[PDB]
A paper describes a structure:
Especially, exposure or modification of N-terminal amino acid residues can mediate protein degradation and the resultant proteolytic procedure is called the N-degron pathway (formerly the N-end rule pathway). Two tertiary degrons, Asn and Gln, are hydrolyzed into the secondary degron Asp and Glu by N-terminal asparagine amidohydrolase 1 ([name]) and N-terminal glutamine amidohydrolase 1 (NTAQ1), respectively. In multicellular eukaryotes, Nt-Asn and Nt-Gln are deamidated by [name]-encoded NtN-amidase and NTAQ1-encoded NtQ-amidase, respectively. In this study, the crystal structure of [name], the last veiled structure among three amidases in the N-degron pathway, was elucidated.
Residue numbers in the entry: 2 to 306
Amino acid sequence: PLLVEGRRVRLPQSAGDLVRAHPPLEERARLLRGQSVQQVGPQGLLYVQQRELAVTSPKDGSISILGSDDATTSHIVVLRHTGNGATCLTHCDGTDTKAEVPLIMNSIKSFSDHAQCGRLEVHLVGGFSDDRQLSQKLTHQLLSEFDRQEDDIHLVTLCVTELNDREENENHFPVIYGIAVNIKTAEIYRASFQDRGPEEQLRAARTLAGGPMISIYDAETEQLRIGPYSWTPFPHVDFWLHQDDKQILENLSTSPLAEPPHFVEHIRSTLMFLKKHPSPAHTLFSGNKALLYKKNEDGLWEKIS
């Protein structure tokens, strides 16, 4: 079940009510929202896209920081066992939360040396008070699915939906769009990411075409493993490529007035990828082999094999 200050959470309950009733949650939210955003560079970074999961631990010699950005109505989730340091960062968008929380749980529970030290801690950030209730629904689903687990999960950070909301000109949008977690130090902090590779377009197209949550990183081999992926041709991809920025925002975004400024440019490059690669399974991959990337000496991703 989900625990706050060592006791069970009553669900359903709004995130704001939870935070107001528990001073540790309120202080964490105040401090997190108050941080200035750090521009996290590529060294030791694994950037996790929407509908992806990455897990590793402090003995990883390649990755020291997990991060995700652009959480508009979606939530970034961090589950950490403070004893062995196993740390999973996930960017959930409400596609199938009941399937996705078990994936996060199993990614951490497989690490042993877990009984003698530490505990399971969970952190949830993202979203805002959006007109379509998408963030609030995601918050409820994540809290409920974690609370139905048998193991004790201690809720440490909760900065979602109404807690993550700001207003300008009667227009609401998120405060925190992105966070990083340092796996060695356990720090979780506000962050933005300019270097989101590798295979940024392939991975974005996989999710725009409707792919489910996937785990992208093999901590044992310190290998990023991309694909093989498959999809059918994206409907009306040429038509959407010919629409103007306002039409793309209103129809291809969950919240047209809350997206970050580069949203349309990002989706145009994803649509172009889909247009160029309507059937990637046997054109972008060989013999069903994943594309393999490892960190090089200077902390950048490099393709192997």
